[model samples]
Target: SCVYIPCTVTALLGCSCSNRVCYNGIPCAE
Candidate 1:
């Protein structure tokens, strides 16, 4: 299974069932 996603920042800022993608994780600011 694969998801044909567009080259958008949202894709990067979200989680996927597969693939090494990460950008939606919580960011702690000090």
Candidate 2:
């Protein structure tokens, strides 16, 4: 299962993807 979150500048710069799919406690997935 995955969790959807709001997009953030810090998360975007680090993940380089939308905060729509949370995996392994991270913001997004590749």
Candidate 3:
């Protein structure tokens, strides 16, 4: 299972999901 965490930095363009995480949106980890 992966848990999503708040993004530390703001997303300039938009949020992108990768490596089970979203940059500028949220972070995830298993």
Displacement of residue 11 (Cα, Å) in model 2 is 10
- Cα lDDT over the full model 1: 0.35
Per-residue lDDT of model 2, residues 1-30, tens digit only = 123444444454555343454333565544
lDDT of 3: 0.41
**What number of clashing residue pairs does each candidate have, in the order they appear?**
0, 0, 0
Q: Compared with the true structure, what per-residue lDDT tens digits does model 3 show for residues 1-30?
A: 112653333333444545535453554332
Residue 7: error of model 3 in Å?
12
Question: Which residues of candidate 2, in runs, are more than 4 Å off?
Answer: 1-3, 10-30
TM-score of each candidate structure, all chains considered together: 0.16, 0.16, 0.25
In candidate 1 the C-alpha lDDT for residue 30 amounts to 14
- Local distance difference test values of all predictions, in order: 0.35, 0.43, 0.41
Better of 1 and 3 by lDDT: 3
lDDT of 1 by residue, 1-30 (tens): 123543244444453324333234642111
Error of 3 at 22 (Å): 0.7
- The candidate maximizing lDDT is 2
